Design a protein around this ligand. Sequence first.
Ligand SMILES: CC(C)(C)C1CCN(CCCn2nc(-c3ccc(C(F)(F)F)c(CNCc4ccc(F)cc4)c3)c3c2CCN(S(C)(=O)=O)C3)CC1
Length: 220
Amino acid sequence: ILPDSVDWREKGCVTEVKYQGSCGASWAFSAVGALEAQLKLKTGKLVSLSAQNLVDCSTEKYGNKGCNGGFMTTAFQYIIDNKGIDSDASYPYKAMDQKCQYDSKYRAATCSKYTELPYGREDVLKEAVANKGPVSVGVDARHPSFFLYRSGVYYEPSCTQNVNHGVLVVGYGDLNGKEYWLVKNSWGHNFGEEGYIRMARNKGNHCGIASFPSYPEILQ
Ligand SMILES: CC(C)(C)C1CCN(CCCn2nc(-c3ccc(C(F)(F)F)c(CNCc4ccc(F)cc4)c3)c3c2CCN(S(C)(=O)=O)C3)CC1
């Protein structure tokens, strides 16, 4: 059976909320966020990974268009093919498309593999958050209510299962009967609950939370 709540921030596996700005790089933040937890698990050290490095280098070959959109899965592939990703401190985020500046001497993480989960299976997503770590997902964030969210379990009746915004599920729980997912966003600390949104869980793949989940792995 499975725990009723998880919160990977309680285990020191989640870095500070980031601020993506004008650049549509939510997918890159989603991807490094998921790897950051796998890295802390392996090495005991928590270090922010370079979303910029994903924006600049995981490009045409991986189906990504930097600040105009991308995929977490093909971001994980880039890190696999590239044999590393830099630390955020060495390759800081600039919220704009740049030429690729990966330097292997400031390699902060590796990626061995990644796994995609079945569309719409929130029980499968729940198991992965418990047993594997935080999971990269997309959500439907194209609703005034999403931007305006300040607290509580977010439920948007007009939300769809088509995803357009990359985020990280770092836990799940329940708030007085309302089951939720704990979601790390990349809109700074002034968004929602210090940068987190708790989204409706077990409500028919609400906002496409479980439409396209994936999580990376660092072996050995
Ligand atoms: C590259 C390769 C090998 C051919 C892959 C083929 C498999 N796969 C595509 C299909 C799976 N998939 N993945 C996503 C998916 C997952 C996460 C996210 C994110 F929000 F987190 F960012 C997004 C949003 N960004 C889209 C974006 C991508 C590149 C760009 F430039 C510009 C924008 C989409 C979707 C689908 C299906 C269609 N939809 S939809 C409306 O929801 O049905 C979305 C990824 C590419």
